[PDB]
Design a protein around this ligand. Structure first.
Ligand SMILES: *Cc1c(COP(=O)(O)O)cnc(C)c1O
Ligand SMILES: *Cc1c(COP(=O)(O)O)cnc(C)c1O
Ligand SMILES: [Mg+2]
Ligand SMILES: [Mg+2]
Ligand code: NA
Ligand code: NA
Lengths: 365, 368
């Protein structure tokens, strides 16, 4: 009877796809990877798609292929998952953590521009919770200074910005982790319009192998390829994505309406034209307004059989980054990081599941 | 295409599909109870203390060397006669691979070659258990102990390999692979066993973002990577581990027939080690010397393919590949170079029929 904050929608279609792969005998990277990549080119309109074993690995090889390393700075929010900051550091580069908008939790072009230095080699905006960042404005800052923008689109499968899917141009990295809007348990995919970057990425995610003749190691690379077992699941889930996101939107709209007369504060919907994917439904819990703290709300909801998530504890408040970058002070991030939680949002939720959550929040206010 | 006999094919059937159904129905599809069961199963299989499932043996090597503190200024002794993943991971941690030769007939490093290559900078030794036979790991370990240098075993080929009556990795540290051509597979995956408590603790953190508990809630203690194994894959690996004994018994039957029926051909299998062992028979490798066989290795592979018979090359020595050839042009490894130019792997997988085996043997006799 526990209602988790997320659960995948796996059924007979996924099992039938798995049966096909197993029957074929070709279970690692093969035709299903190619079909998934072609499908994401059709979805986004971008040129190149590279399937990978996780969005974290995708970020690792994308930054590596761009040549980012010691002496380089990478602008990123602290208000994101730690994978991006970790990959910057593990390439020897320096994350430059910037604040986010206090109500949609995404970086602004002004904050990006203020943080640019002669060392900046990449800017990594996050499309947060299913809404897009103001990517044209961020891209314009990058273009003015000759700095590439790499989009963290983990939350943005099915997100549109000014009438196009996220990643229609430039470079973006999607996630297929279990709680994402389409999942193959673990997986990811990079889209890019940059031919050379795409060529480097494909080699660096598969041992650095390339043709100088037979394939051989051109420069050392990692192992981040996606098996066809997983790619086949992702194809089924992509086929379901439009309907899944429609259901998520219906649930989120009901949360927006029925929590309007509670002190719990959702994120604000951006003013630029978009279609929200509704990956997460985040609320801010301020004890002064709500009569209950964020941590206690999570605990009491759990005691009522209702799961919640924390997306995310800001990276700069975590031990490694807190001690390496003690000077970082990001007020909007710090205020929200202490007050946000994610309430249940997934397309297998019934109307009664949603009513249960809303009733509990009303009771706990 | 339907009549092509590849050099390997997985054995995936209703049992694997039923395991996948269970995980999907549960809704818990990434790392969870199937990972824990797989790890416990490998602790029971090997007798070792700690088992850490990972997304690939390459990733496992990456985080194991990282957890050991391997980095700039450190040397790591390894064969060139192995898969390039190990050399790459050494280099991508900033460390220096020190490539040594292998025995000319079993393609595994010797304690003497390891000892000769040790310097004050050596921080690890990585023997490879090749094709399903174990390296002489007690002798290699003794060299490491004498100099205080850890030995990390590449056991990708050695699921089901025994050495002096124990499974590979019963002590020390070893890394298994569950890639599609390995004797048990979940398409992509691997697993580290270790008897070192601190190393295991570091590895578990470093394969999942560096998360740990401060001296409280989990937080990044130091940056780590993402190399966890999904439960969908762990569930497949559990079925395949349950099948492993019978799969390896069939592989041994096939390999024994190759050993017998190629004995009167000029093709030269690897030699069986003199130390007590049980061979897993991951690969059946033959040496193709044009003087003895009347045909070259490359041409044999091409002609076998024209006959609908697949082969593999395990492996083109790392030091002969562009990056390593140009970075380490001074490396000269005679046994490795001789074999690398002459080896290929003929079909060996447990779903092969007796008639499939006869087809391979007949073609090799015809092409001699
Ligand atoms: C979890 C997540 C990632 C990493 O994705 P994986 O596929 O799990 O590696 C990156 N960015 C954001 C915003 C995420 O939520
Ligand atoms: C393939 C292989 C590896 C790497 O295993 P993955 O699971 O593919 O990362 C390591 N060592 C040897 C000897 C191999 O054949
Ligand atoms: Mg409200
Ligand atoms: Mg012979
Ligand atoms: Na939507
Ligand atoms: Na055997």
């Amino acid at each position: 009877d526990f209602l988790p904050f997320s659960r995948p929608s796996m059924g007979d279609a996924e099992l039938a796809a798995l049966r096909e792969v197993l029957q074929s005998g070709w279970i690692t990277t093969g035709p299903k990877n190619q079909a998934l990549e072609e499908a994401f080119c059709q979805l986004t309109g971008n040129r190149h798609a590279i399937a990978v074993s996780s969005a974290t690995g995708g970020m690792h090889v994308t930054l590596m292929a761009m040549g980012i390393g010691p002496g380089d700075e990478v602008i990123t929010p602290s208000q994101t998952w730690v994978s991006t900051l970790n990959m910057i550091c593990l390439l020897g580069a320096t994350p430059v953590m910037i604040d986010v908008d206090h109500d949609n939790l995404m970086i602004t072009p002004e904050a990006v521009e203020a943080a640019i230095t002669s060392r900046t080699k990449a800017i990594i905006p996050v499309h947060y919770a299913g809404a897009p960042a103001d990517i044209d404005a961020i891209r314009a800052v990058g273009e003015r200074h000759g700095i590439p923008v790499i989009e963290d689109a983990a939350h943005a499968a099915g997100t549109h910005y000014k009438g196009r899917h996220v990643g229609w141009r430039g470079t973006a990295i999607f996630s297929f982790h279990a709680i994402k809007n389409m999942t193959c348990a673990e997986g990811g995919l990079i889209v890019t319009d940059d031919d050379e970057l795409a060529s480097r990425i494909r080699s660096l995610k598969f041992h650095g192998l390339g043709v100088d003749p037979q394939a051989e190691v051109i420069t050392p690379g990692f192992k981040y390829n996606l098996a066809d077992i997983n790619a086949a699941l992702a194809l089924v889930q992509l086929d379901k994505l439009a309907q899944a996101n429609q259901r998520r939107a219906e649930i989120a709209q009901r949360y927006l309406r029925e929590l309007a007369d509670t002190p719990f504060k959702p994120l604000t919907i951006p003013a630029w034209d978009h279609q929200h994917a509704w990956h997460l439904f985040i609320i801010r819990v301020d004890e002064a307004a709500c009569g209950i703290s964020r941590d206690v709300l999570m605990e009491k909801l759990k005691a009522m059989g209702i799961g919640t998530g924390l997306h995310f504890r800001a990276a700069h408040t975590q031990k490694y980054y807190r001690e390496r970058f003690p000077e970082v002070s990001l007020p909007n991030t710090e205020w929200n990081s202490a007050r946000i939680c994610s309430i249940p949002l997934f397309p297998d939720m019934t109307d009664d599941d949603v009513t249960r959550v809303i009733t509990a929040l009303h009771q706990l206010s």
